[PDB]
């Protein structure tokens, strides 16, 4: 339930598979690698896995190749990090009935699907919880480990810009930079790594932009054929919904992205007050008050857009009193 | 001079004018207001001024209206912050050698033009130096003052992206947020305030973009008529050079901007190693190892661009 029990369980087991969520992000990579490396420093036999391609922006990060897609491994313990439901780890959810499991997560909707669960939504990033676990285990940080742990705190707060960048976030960042975290490397690789093809793709997104409610709601979409024409994938569009939110006067931005064929990811971002996690959760996804999402399979963009936007529109209009 | 002498000088004067630089940025607003408000807590009569319009993105900040353009004031002491030479403060340079003056700055090419000068280029922002002065003066931060002092640290590190975001930057940011700095407010006002017209403007920047040296140099330009065509000003283009640096593989980005007619501002940004301040300084400007600029008056943009690019390319090879 709490950190102390999870530390004990981690200490009790030797052969550990650490698993993160599909469509991984910086906090997934950060949490998986920081815990994996910490456990290896203790002398444990560990592998790391995500049922998804790792985005190109992580290619230069130290030890990124320890995250596998198809590990061959006989674990005594499964550790699932940064993932709110079993569906979020893809094919590794088949291990949940076979191998004892620990969940470590900061999402408030986490279904507590492990044998042991430490879920604390007062953190901005699961990487903050791994930092505390590692310190409680006595793991000594070098600059690479500090850089890897800094990654998730930076990305989940928008590099200290979002509503979740509180005192504890800045304190953790300071501690990690003091330990040698390369904050410039992290920002360069995540934020200054744009393929030029992105700009043309984003122009098409602006072309298709739709405005509702005096311009306070904005949404657009990228169908699969459009990714193809621009020689782009979902890795290329990762910053787009935040760019739509940055438009003056917009309170909610929504981007629908079909990649690969038939899989529609819906990203939602809000600015001052609208709780987008409430919309996402009711649609079957999850997230946070200012950033949330949901994913559909086998469905048509002509049906997802009205279903999502009509539900969002209703909840937005109700949010006035 | 060191900080301790400057703190002594500040304590010795009760009527003080705090001045920042023309074309003000976040560190200028941050430094000017944080020092002014700090000194006022000692009971002193303090005015703040910049010989320039304050950009729109600062208009919701607490006490922003304290920065005047035309103060009517007889100070005993002039304090110049975040400005590397007398020219950078516009008409207030006329006060030098008439009112005793203090310079507080983090630019390495500061000409030391005050009677007292504390210049420390190891800081990422002059706001960090103002923070330490206010602490030495013994004043108390509330959340408004913490937010105003946080502003310059945030903007001058590119919100913790630039290579100047060292451990001391994160320590200061932590201490200010602990005192109530509203980091989310600062980011939203500066970065989430984009006009639709800005996106059309940037599209023109991308149409004129050139990549040189196998994609390691990116440059473009905005002429005056293009600003007008898009109903934009140079306030709309303020983040553009950073967007060009964010292209994969680009080491240095350069943006030439003519606004208003006959004034050409050249903005430069680099990623890993190229010292753009050496280029800017040699052309008559200044700045920092990874961010620098120069401004020309009365010159033709079609003449400035090939000469600046030629000098840049020459320095780029020598740096290699
Ligand atoms: N449960 C769940 N949460 C999601 C899904 N997609 C996005 N999220 C949540 O929404 C946040 C933002 O996702 P993004 O819009 O960046 O894809 C994530 O941090 C995650 O918490 C999804 O398919 N399922
Ligand atoms: N001396 C001098 N420095 C400048 C000038 N323009 C820009 N800089 C320097 O270059 C940096 C970046 O300028 P920006 O590109 O953001 O306009 C500034 O922080 C400042 O130190 C100028 O006209 N003169
Ligand atoms: Mn995640
Ligand atoms: Mn999340
Ligand atoms: Mn400045
Ligand atoms: Mn400067």
Q: What is the DSSP string of B306-320?
A: HHHHHHHHHHHHHH-
Ligand 5 centroid–CA B245 distance in Å is 20
- Report the distance separating Cα B74 and Cα B83, nearest Å: 21
Ligand 1 pocket, residues with Cβ under 6 angstroms: A 84-85, 88, 107, 267, 285-287, 291-295
- Report the distance separating Cα A235 and Cα B200, nearest Å: 24
Chain B residues within 8 Å of chain A (Cβ atoms)? 154, 158-163, 165-167, 170-171, 173-174, 177-178, 183-184, 187-188, 191-196, 199, 203, 206, 245-248, 250, 271-272
Q: In this complex, do A184 and B206 lie within 8 Å of one another by their Cβ atoms?
A: no
Q: In this complex, do A167 and B187 lie within 8 Å of one another by their Cβ atoms?
A: no
- Quickly tell me which residue has 């290329």 as its tokens: A236
- Quickly tell me which residue has 């005047």 as its tokens: B68
Cβ neighbours of residue A43 closer than 8 Å, sequence gap 6 or more: none
A318: left (phi over 0), alpha (psi -120 to 50) or beta: alpha
- Report the distance separating Cα A200 and Cα A164, nearest Å: 31
- Quickly tell me which residue has 């079909």 as its tokens: A258
Q: Are A240 and A255 in contact (CB under 8 A)?
A: yes
Q: In this complex, do B170 and A167 lie within 8 Å of one another by their Cβ atoms?
A: no
Task: Please report the resolution in angstroms.
Answer: 1.9
- Report the distance separating Cα B45 and Cα B53, nearest Å: 23
Strand A217-222 relative to strand A252-258, pairing = parallel
Strands (E) in chain B, as ranges, are: 15-19, 45-49, 67-68, 77-81, 101-105, 116-119, 210-212, 217-222, 252-258, 263-270, 286-288, 291-297
Distances in Å between the Cα of B196 and the Cα atoms of A35, A246, B243 are 43, 10, 16
- Report the distance separating Cα A220 and Cα A211, nearest Å: 9
Count other C-beta atoms under 10 Å from residue B197's C-beta: 14
Query: Which helix or strand (DSSP H or E) is residue B169 part of?
Result: helix B167-178
Q: How many CA atoms lie within 13 A of B86 on its CB side?
A: 13
How many CB pairs (< 8 A) connect A and B? 100
Q: Are B85 and B110 in contact (CB under 8 A)?
A: yes
C-alpha Rg value of chain B to the nearest Å:
19
- Report the distance separating Cα A180 and Cα B167, nearest Å: 9
Q: Which residues pair with A212 in a beta bridge?
A: A217
- Report the distance separating Cα B167 and Cα A178, nearest Å: 6
Strand B263-270 relative to strand B291-297, pairing = antiparallel
Q: In this complex, do B248 and A184 lie within 8 Å of one another by their Cβ atoms?
A: no
Q: Which residues pair with A39 in a beta bridge?
A: none
- Report the distance separating Cα A68 and Cα A74, nearest Å: 14
Please tell me the number of the ligand nearest to residue B88's CA. 2
Distances in Å between the Cα of A61 and the Cα atoms of A26, A58, A82, A126, A269 are 11, 5, 19, 18, 27
Closest CA to B298 of B260, B245, B255: B260
Tokens of A268: 């939602």
Closest CA to A221 of A204, A242, A198, A200: A204
CA distance A9 to chain B (A): 33
CA distance A199 to chain B (A): 8
Q: Which among B292, B297, B299, B312 is the best mutation to test ligand 2's pocket, defined by most ligand atoms within 8 Å of the CB?
A: B292
Ligand 4 centroid–CA A125 distance in Å is 8
- Report the distance separating Cα A307 and Cα A305, nearest Å: 6
| Method by which the coordinates were obtained | X-ray
Q: Starting at the edge strand that comes first in sequence, how are the strands of the sheet with B77-81 ordered?
A: B67-68, B45-49, B15-19, B77-81, B101-105, B116-119
Closest CA to B57 of B25, B34, B83: B25
CA distance A17 to chain B (A): 33
- Report the distance separating Cα B160 and Cα B155, nearest Å: 8
- Quickly tell me which residue has 């960042």 as its tokens: A173
- Report the distance separating Cα B156 and Cα A172, nearest Å: 21
Q: In this complex, do A194 and B248 lie within 8 Å of one another by their Cβ atoms?
A: yes
Strand B263-270 relative to strand B252-258, pairing = antiparallel
- Report the distance separating Cα A217 and Cα A276, nearest Å: 12
Q: Which residues of A205-228 are buried (b: 16+ CB within 10 A; e: fewer)?
A: bbeebeeeeeebbbbbbbbbebbe
Is residue B259 reached through a cis peptide bond, with omega within 30 degrees of 0 on the bond before it? Answer: no
CA angle at residue B282 from B276 to B285, to 5 degrees? 75
Ligand 6 centroid–CA A86 distance in Å is 50
């Amino acid at each position: 339930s709490g950190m102390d029990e999870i530390v004990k369980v981690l200490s009790q087991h030797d052969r550990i598979l650490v698993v993160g969520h599909i469509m991984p992000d910086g906090d997934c990579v950060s949490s998986v690698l920081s815990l994996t490396l910490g456990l290896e420093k203790l002398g444990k036999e560990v592998k790391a896995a995500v049922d998804y391609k790792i985005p190109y922006v992580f290619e230069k990060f130290p030890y990124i190749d320890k995250i596998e897609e198809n590990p061959n491994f006989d674990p005594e313990l499964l550790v699932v990090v940064n993932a709110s439901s079993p569906d979020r780890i893809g094919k590794f959810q088949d291990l949940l009935d076979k191998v004892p499991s620990v969940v470590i997560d900061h999402h408030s909707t986490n279904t507590n699907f492990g044998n042991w669960n430490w879920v604390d939504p007062s953190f901005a990033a699961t990487a903050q919880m791994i930092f505390r676990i590692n310190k409680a285990l006595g793991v000594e940080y070098d600059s690479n480990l500090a850089t890897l742990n800094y990654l998730g705190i930076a990305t989940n707060t928008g590099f200290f810009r979002h509503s979740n960048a509180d005192v504890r976030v800045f304190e953790d960042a300071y501690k990690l930079v003091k330990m040698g975290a390369d904050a410039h490397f992290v920002a360069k690789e995540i934020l200054e790594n744009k393929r030029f093809e992105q700009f043309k793709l984003f122009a098409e997104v602006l072309e298709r932009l739709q405005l509702l409610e005096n311009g306070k709601i904005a949404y657009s979409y990228i169908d699969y054929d459009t990714y193809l024409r621009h020689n782009c994938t979902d890795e290329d569009s990762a910053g787009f919904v935040g760019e739509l939110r940055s438009i003056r006067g917009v309170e909610v931005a929504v981007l629908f992205m079909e990649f690969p064929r038939g899989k529609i990811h819906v990203s939602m971002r809000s600015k001052d007050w609208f709780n987008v996690n409430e919309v996402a959760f009711e649609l079957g996804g999850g997230g946070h008050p200012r950033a949330a999402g949901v994913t559909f399979e086998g469905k048509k963009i002509e049906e997802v857009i009205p279903r999502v936007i009509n539900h969002l529109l209703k909840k937005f209009k109700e949010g006035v009193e």
